[PDB]
Amino acid sequence: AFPKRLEYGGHALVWSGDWSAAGARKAIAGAARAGYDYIEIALLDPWQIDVALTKDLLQEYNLRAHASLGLSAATDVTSTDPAIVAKGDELLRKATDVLYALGGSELCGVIYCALGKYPGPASRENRANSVAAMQRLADYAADKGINIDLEVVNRYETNIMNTGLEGLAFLDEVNRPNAFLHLDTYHMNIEENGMAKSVLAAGDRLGYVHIGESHRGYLGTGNVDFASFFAALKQIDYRGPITFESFSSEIVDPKLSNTLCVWRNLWHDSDDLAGKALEFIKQRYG
Amino acid sequence: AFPKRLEYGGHALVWSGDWSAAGARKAIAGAARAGYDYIEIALLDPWQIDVALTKDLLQEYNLRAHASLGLSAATDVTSTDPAIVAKGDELLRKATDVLYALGGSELCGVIYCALGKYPGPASRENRANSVAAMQRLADYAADKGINIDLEVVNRYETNIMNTGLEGLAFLDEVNRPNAFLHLDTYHMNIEENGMAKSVLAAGDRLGYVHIGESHRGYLGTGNVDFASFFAALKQIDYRGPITFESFSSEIVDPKLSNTLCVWRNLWHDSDDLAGKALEFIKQRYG
Ligand SMILES: O=C(CO)[C@H](O)[C@H](O)[C@H](O)CO
Ligand SMILES: O=C(CO)[C@H](O)[C@H](O)[C@H](O)CO
Ligand SMILES: [Mn+2]
Ligand SMILES: [Mn+2]
């Protein structure tokens, strides 16, 4: 495992629907302006990013970067189609290479399956293939000082693991020192028996955190018990990335946004949303 | 409005994944054993139901019945395909006919669209088509002394309306005396700004309630603020059906369960779950 620090990040889609040269500048300037330690770049297509341009922007605004992604049908590492697993491995290697080039140390999100709504439950083979793929990815990432954090998401976004408890059982089959649990308050709000159980169970295996309101809008205007969740992080003295994550129809990534079913306009002002979110988080943690 | 009374029901999928002679009896016996006033039949294919058999079962167990359903792609009344909208009209008419033959008074659930994930946001055409289909259904239902209740569901299950406030605007566009809002605590837990606002706004327009835990499991083992929700119902003196709704991989309807992404086992003992649920509800609204 590679060093983790308590640091606060903003998800790219708070600012930019695309990672164009302009999109990258807007989002990096945005996160820096709001007082975030890092930007979390969504690498659903890790070939599209101009890596040298982004590195220059990170230097220019004195900002760090981590990376999240979700696979697609074409790159689903759970697939019993070996060719599809191989495309997944390839995308995950490229995502790792981009992260390393940007000086990042965390590759997180739905990296262990296709992000979206499976029409049926995962077979034993689906899970086994995901475990093996996360073993190959962890081993690849280990050579480049990178930790992987598997994001537990709700039933509409994966059929592999929907609770931190399920994630930990999975991580125990993976059995890699640089593979961690990634929890997200939005997803926890749906799946978890309260906001503390999985955090307490994870302890040092909790490698990465997403802060999202129940509707993914303004923090504290929804149903997420943040009092409970932040008390739990304290009880294990969590010291790792915490990125604010929010999706509004105002800022749209043609794939990610429709996959995430973001039908509603829950905000318009990126800077106001991100500014208030960071104040909300730091008032309750750190 | 056709008569509504404060009464408690169990959703069929608490007991049975099919509506065969054996499945119908298992669900109706289960509801009766737990002391529910009614069973809610999941009528996703209303041509499947043996109506005489079910009517006999309802007599045998001294139980009333309401029906919920979700449309599918082939019967989507939001569709810009007039043949698909027509198929929707036909299925909802058949559903109404079944409910009428069972002496039921409530057709509820996702009757206004295809239950599931849409590839993009609903157009004003999609919504207009839905409102007009719900007008036609309400008028057909009214001839048979049946109320319809529009169930607001989360972003992964509809693009038409995800909050009670959105539900009420759709409802008033329908503009029919026997059309009502249907709220579900599980969906509210995701989309709503607290558990009171939509209920207080709805008042007499709220015609049907589903009680589901955040994870659709045992009541009071999740994240739903039931205290706030039940306080709000009291404020508006809600006197309508209240269905306990829960899904576990323990009991599978091979269509509905997969559509609802029930990957996890949240319970194994139907009678324990249903019994404890009713006690939980009557303790807070009895
Ligand atoms: O919560 C999420 C999706 O619902 C994750 O943050 C995303 O899958 C991913 O991180 C986006 O890049
Ligand atoms: O909660 C629901 C689905 O998530 C609705 O009640 C269902 O679509 C339907 O009513 C089940 O029959
Ligand atoms: Mn997340
Ligand atoms: Mn429901």
Numbering used by the authors:
A (entry chain A), B (entry chain B): 2 to 287
Show sentences the authors wrote.
Here, we report the isolation of a novel protein from Methylomonas sp. expected to be a putative enzyme based on sequence similarity to ketose 3‐epimerase. The synthesized gene encoding the deduced ketose 3‐epimerase was expressed as a recombinant enzyme in Escherichia coli, and it exhibited the highest enzymatic activity toward l‐ribulose, followed by d‐ribulose and d‐allulose. The X‐ray structure analysis of l‐ribulose 3‐epimerase from Methylomonas sp. (MetLRE) revealed a homodimeric enzyme, the first reported structure of dimeric l‐ribulose 3‐epimerase.
d‐Allulose has potential as a low‐calorie sweetener which can suppress fat accumulation. MetLRE is the first dimeric l‐ribulose 3‐epimerase identified to exhibit high relative activity toward d‐allulose.
